[PDB]
Design a protein around this ligand. Structure first.
Ligand code: RTO
Length: 500
């Protein structure tokens, strides 16, 4: 049993802590890269630029007013003061708060403001692609080698996106940066669990969710001192150059080495760690024959989830839970400008509510159960988003509190759905089901920017859609069975026995 070798070579020793911390460090900037468009693509107030030949009645005579008493964003009078025409001569952007964003740089306003959501959608497309493309590559080149490439790719793509000359190049490199960063998080949990004892896997999963939470604090601080979008994009990308330098000293997972049929590589990795842990004597006792004897016992397809009728309803129901959680999450954390409060304050509060929300989730999970915790978190998040759309924008304090509560509930749902998925699937398909569930989360983060484009015609439509989906997801949770206090299933037969 590989757990016995891990315990023999040191268990949770110096090497485990060092490698875990080094590997989990990029998760701090993971959130910054995920939600950078809140600050690099912020929309400042804008209006039609008056004609160059005309002399500034003044500016107020050239801009028609709206119902709220503000100049129209993309309408100007043909003659000074009533025929209105779009901004042929460009827009004038208020630089009091945002000196320059991709919206002001390339005029992604009005007839072109849908390009702002397309850039975020394309970045999440790379995140989905990186999960699938680099997931297969990790199983061939190893988790360490792929992590070295991902640090280089993120630094190069992030720097290149900062120096992008036009919109097309920015979208391509944002997609490329997402590909490596998606596998950075995936290979961070994979490489960590293979070097850590089975009884401490829950700590790794909890820690990764934590490091993502303090990553939201970092983005608000970084974006505050670095308001320019080109500098902000570059600043959050150059640390991966440093991570690339020290990633050469990582130790490849010994479990993967055995799966590749290379026991000599497995033995050297185990002996090297025991040197670090201070157990050279036990490491010297290990031999190639001993590894074969211990790992002999250790040594289904993704289409099985759609073939077995019992597994079908588990895969379908869990997919909606994964989709709706991420679909509503990214439709809410990527709309920080509508609450009437400073965006840096909202980002700080959004990351601050994560800590009590996950703490409350563990209390509810252990007390009432996984299913009531999943229903309550999704239903409350859906209700909070729905009420947010109904309430007028003038209630900045009330609307912010509902968004913060909804964000906390959605973050609560993310923690519960990860634990719920592990205890639902049998051990034969537990890893495949977890990967497929995370895939649907990435799909939800792709469709969410597309739904946000519907604010062109119906301003309240995205909020209604972002809120209605979690409500339906809470209903579909009732079909799932409660797993609190129940033994973990091993085969498909255990699933039928529990249902019967
Ligand atoms: C399975 C990946 C989920 N994600 C969506 C991918 C597009 S995620 O962005 O990486 C994320 C979000 C929030 C939390 C949390 O606060 O618990 C953790 C992870």
């Amino acid at each position: 049993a590989f757990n016995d070798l891990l315990k023999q070579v040191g268990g949770v020793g110096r090497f485990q802590l060092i490698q875990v911390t080094m590997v989990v460090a990029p998760l701090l900037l993971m959130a910054s890269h995920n939600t950078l468009q809140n600050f690099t693509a912020a929309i400042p107030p804008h209006h039609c630029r008056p004609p160059a030949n005309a002399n500034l009645g003044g500016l107020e005579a050239w801009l028609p007013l709206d119902k709220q008493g503000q100049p129209e964003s993309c309408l100007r009078f043909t003659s000074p003061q009533r025929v209105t025409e779009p901004c042929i001569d460009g827009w004038v952007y208020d630089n009091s708060t945002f000196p320059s964003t991709i919206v002001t740089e390339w005029n992604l306003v009005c007839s072109h403001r849908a390009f702002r959501q397309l850039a975020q959608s394309l970045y999440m497309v790379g995140v989905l692609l990186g999960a699938m493309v680099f997931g297969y590559l990790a199983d061939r080149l190893g988790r360490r080698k792929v992590l070295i490439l991902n640090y280089l790719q993120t630094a190069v793509s992030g720097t290149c996106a900062a120096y992008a000359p036009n919109y097309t190049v920015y979208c391509v490199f944002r997609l490329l940066s997402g590909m490596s960063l998606a596998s950075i998080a995936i290979n961070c949990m994979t490489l960590n669990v293979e070097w850590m004892p089975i009884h401490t896997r829950a700590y790794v999963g909890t820690l990764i969710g934590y490091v993502y939470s303090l990553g939201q604090f970092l983005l608000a601080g970084i974006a505050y001192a670095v308001p320019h979008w080109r500098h902000l994009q570059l600043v959050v990308s150059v640390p991966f150059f440093i991570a690339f330098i020290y990633s050469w000293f990582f130790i490849e997972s010994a479990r993967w080495y055995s799966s590749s049929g290379r026991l000599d590589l497995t033995l050297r990795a185990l002996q090297r760690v025991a040197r670090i842990n201070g157990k050279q004597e036990e490491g010297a006792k290990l031999s190639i024959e001993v590894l074969r004897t211990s790992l002999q016992k250790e040594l289904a397809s993704a289409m099985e989830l759609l073939r077995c009728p019992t597994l079908r309803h588990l895969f379908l129901c869990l997919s909606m839970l994964w989709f709706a959680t991420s679909f509503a999450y990214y439709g809410l954390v990527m709309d920080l400008q509508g609450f009437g409060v400073s965006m840096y304050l909202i980002q700080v509060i959004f990351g601050a509510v994560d800590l009590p929300a996950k703490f409350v989730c563990f209390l509810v999970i252990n007390s009432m159960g996984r299913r009531p915790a999943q229903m309550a978190s999704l239903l409350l998040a859906g209700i909070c988003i729905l009420v947010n759309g109904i309430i007028p924008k003038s209630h900045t304090i009330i609307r912010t509190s509902l968004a913060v509560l909804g964000k906390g509930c959605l973050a609560s749902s993310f923690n519960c759905i990860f634990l719920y998925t592990g205890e639902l699937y049998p051990t034969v398909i537990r890893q495949t089901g977890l990967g497929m569930g995370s895939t649907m989360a990435r799909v939800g983060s792709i469709v969410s920017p597309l739904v946000s484009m519907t604010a062109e015609f119906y301003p309240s439509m995205p909020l209604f859609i972002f809120g209605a989906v979690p409500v339906v997801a809470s209903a579909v949770t009732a079909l799932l069975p409660e797993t609190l206090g129940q033994p973990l299933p091993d085969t498909v037969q255990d699933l039928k026995s529990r249902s019967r």
